[PDB]
């Protein structure tokens, strides 16, 4: 159906930047979104950052402006541009993609997932 692979993982010091990024791959003519989430240490996944096919962005409370996520239809990825980073953004990040396929008999909705990159960042 549609696979996803991640890269960009780091260890930075407060303040600096890295930069995540996700390619998709077989049906990606049916992705509506690309999204991040992130689990921190001890928590819960939790959403941080959506972009739709028509290009709407929306990012969790706890962004505040600091990252950028795009869509790459050359090369069918997303990507999150990390900046101004905190301890607190210390967390495990995941890649999704969202949309709907036909699977022979039906529309059906359908979510994907990358295996996730390790971000740490320290004082």
């Known amino acids: 159906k549609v696979q996803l692979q991640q890269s960009g993982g780091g260890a930075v010091q407060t303040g600096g930047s890295l930069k995540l990024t996700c390619l998709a791959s077989?049906?990606?003519?049916?992705?509506?979104?690309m999204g991040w989430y992130r689990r921190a240490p001890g928590k819960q996944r939790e959403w941080v950052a959506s972009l739709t096919t028509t290009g709407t962005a929306d990012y969790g409370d706890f962004v505040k402006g600091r990252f950028t996520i795009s869509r790459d239809n050359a090369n069918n990825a997303a990507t999150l541009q990390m900046d101004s980073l905190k301890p607190e953004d210390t967390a495990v990040y995941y890649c999704?993609?969202?949309?709907?396929?036909?699977?022979?008999?039906?529309?059906?909705?359908?979510?994907?997932w990358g295996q996730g990159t390790q971000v740490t960042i320290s004082s």
């Open positions: 999704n993609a969202d949309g709907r396929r036909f699977d022979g008999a039906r529309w059906r909705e359908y979510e994907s």
């Open positions: 077989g049906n990606t003519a049916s992705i509506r979104a």
